[PDB]
């Protein structure tokens, strides 16, 4: 298959952007992988950003969405016009059936930490992720592949992936990038309307408001926390926990999650937690 | 950083994966084609018939793992005369090192024939595969046809999960009276390993018979096992290629399995259906 560097080049099928990653890798250049469901806003830029920054780096973004067999916002041509912009040279778009060519057969089985947390009313839904992710992996071999922080739980059970099965690809997790006032930014914002926008708020403010607690031990970080979210009219708290950075159920390092309903609007929010000296 | 010691030509042992996966990468660099065959130890034929068709890739330089899911200097001794130049001998705390996590598990077929008694087994067997591809990213990887099964359910891990290896199935080597070889036959007391031979027999029969039809084939396996004394038939299949049904015609595979005191025996065959 042609490459054209310096522009964006979108592959549907896994042999192609698997043969033009080999023969990029085979002359020099680090293949950098940013997996993603599309509809991409500025902390998915964020992920292209940092990968982008990696000398000798070419970077693949791909786009890909589960087939859901028994609401996900899906704007393609937009997608790429953002990552020409962001001067990305491989987006890899694949179809379902060049994925699932066999329904699911083989499939990945994570740890305990999947039933947990975002997997306790989904207990196959991590099962459902790291499966696309090691196929992905597999079939673009990176040297490295960038996971945002947003979605915590994520990125530590890929991080379980690649050291349980030997994966030769370093995970590099990025920050979360938030709006003005703190909310995390997420394709599921566009869900919230202008109440719900402002009230959503709450979950950064809690979390913030946890950190900078901390410093009075684990139990005031979390009262602060839960004082900030119920003061929040449409704000239904699913979860707010506290964990260490592994997500055990904790030392000195820790961090606090948190999942709320808005309406129909679920919300996901993380923050590092530092308990007593130093941090704050 | 700094690549481990290889000496070309001698048997270069390393029990840590960082280690073998630097060498192999290392190799791969070089213009060599890594060739990966995974076994169990307690080396005998079957194994180096495996070692020997790695061998002749142009280029091959031959990895031999070594490994135990929860005499080494005997089979090390056999590699070394076979010209074999890496074993990898990891423990199992370097193979596990958080424990079982993350798992692989397979689709539907790991339940059928091996998986009845063993309906873990396949889970475990495609966990240690997979890591084995991850640490060693051979060019081709190894697996005898004794484990039928077994090789079936590689192929669909490494097409299921995008694998860039090519596996490749070596006939099973036989004793001189055909009983498939394994480290299990030295348990057969004379009765047991007299009878054993119905197994092959029996299969062999079948491929035979064949011309005359799928029932033929499986009346005449069947007729030779009852022949046999202490022979505690577990299976007597036959499937296509992939394990799925038995087209009307085309090829298949007839599989036995059976329980001769407390050793259990299993042998295969291909088979051409008129
Ligand atoms: C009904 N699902 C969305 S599906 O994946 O089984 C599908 C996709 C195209 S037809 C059915
Ligand atoms: C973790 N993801 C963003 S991924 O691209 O591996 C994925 C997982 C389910 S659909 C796309
Ligand atoms: C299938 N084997 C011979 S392997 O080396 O991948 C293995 C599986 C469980 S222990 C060794």
């Given at each position: 298959?042609?490459?054209?560097?310096?522009?964006?080049?979108?592959?549907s099928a896994p042999?192609?952007?698997?043969?033009?990653?080999?023969?990029?890798?085979?002359?020099?250049?680090?293949?950098?992988?940013?997996?993603?469901?599309?509809?991409?806003?500025?902390?998915?830029?964020?992920?292209?950003?940092?990968?982008?920054?990696?000398?000798?780096?070419?970077?693949?973004?791909?786009?890909f969405?589960?087939?859901?067999?028994?609401?996900?916002?899906?704007?393609?041509?937009?997608?790429?016009?953002?990552?020409?912009?962001?001067?990305?040279?491989?987006?890899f778009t694949p179809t379902?059936?060049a994925m699932?060519?066999?329904?699911?057969?083989?499939?990945?089985?994570?740890?305990?930490?999947?039933?947990?947390?975002?997997?306790?009313?989904?207990?196959?839904?991590?099962?459902?992720?790291?499966?696309?992710?090691?196929?992905?992996?597999?079939?673009?071999?990176?040297?490295?592949?960038?996971?945002?922080?947003?979605?915590?739980?994520?990125?530590?059970?890929?991080?379980?992936?690649?050291?349980?099965?030997?994966?030769?690809?370093?995970?590099?997790?990025?920050?979360?990038?938030?709006?003005?006032?703190?909310?995390?930014?997420?394709?599921?914002?566009?869900?919230?309307?202008?109440?719900?926008?402002?009230?959503?708020?709450?979950?950064?403010?809690?979390?913030?408001?946890?950190?900078?607690?901390?410093?009075?031990?684990?139990?005031?970080?979390?009262?602060?926390?839960?004082?900030?979210?119920?003061?929040?009219?449409?704000?239904?708290?699913?979860?707010?926990?506290?964990?260490?950075?592994?997500?055990?159920?904790?030392?000195?390092?820790?961090?606090?999650?948190?999942?709320?309903?808005?309406?129909?609007?679920?919300?996901?929010?993380?923050?590092?937690?530092?308990?007593?000296?130093?941090?704050?």
């Amino acid at each position: 298959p042609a490459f054209h560097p310096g522009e964006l080049n979108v592959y549907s099928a896994p042999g192609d952007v698997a043969d033009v990653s080999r023969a990029l890798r085979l002359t020099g250049r680090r293949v950098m992988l940013v997996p993603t469901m599309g509809a991409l806003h500025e902390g998915h830029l964020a992920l292209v950003r940092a990968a982008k920054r990696v000398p000798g780096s070419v970077v693949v973004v791909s786009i890909f969405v589960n087939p859901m067999q028994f609401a996900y916002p899906r704007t393609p041509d937009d997608d790429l016009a953002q990552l020409r912009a962001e001067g990305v040279e491989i987006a890899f778009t694949p179809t379902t059936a060049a994925m699932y060519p066999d329904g699911l057969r083989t499939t990945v089985q994570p740890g305990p930490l999947a039933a947990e947390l975002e997997g306790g009313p989904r207990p196959t839904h991590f099962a459902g992720v790291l499966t696309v992710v090691l196929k992905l992996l597999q079939i673009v071999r990176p040297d490295r592949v960038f996971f945002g922080e947003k979605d915590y739980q994520q990125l530590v059970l890929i991080r379980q992936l690649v050291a349980d099965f030997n994966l030769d690809v370093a995970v590099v997790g990025v920050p979360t990038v938030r709006e003005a006032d703190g909310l995390a930014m997420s394709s599921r914002n566009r869900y919230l309307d202008p109440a719900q926008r402002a009230a959503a708020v709450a979950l950064s403010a809690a979390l913030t408001a946890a950190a900078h607690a901390a410093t009075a031990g684990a139990q005031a970080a979390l009262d602060a926390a839960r004082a900030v979210l119920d003061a929040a009219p449409g704000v239904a708290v699913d979860y707010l926990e506290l964990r260490d950075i592994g997500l055990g159920p904790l030392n000195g390092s820790g961090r606090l999650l948190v999942a709320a309903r808005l309406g129909t609007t679920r919300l996901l929010d993380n923050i590092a937690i530092e308990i007593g000296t130093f941090a704050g």
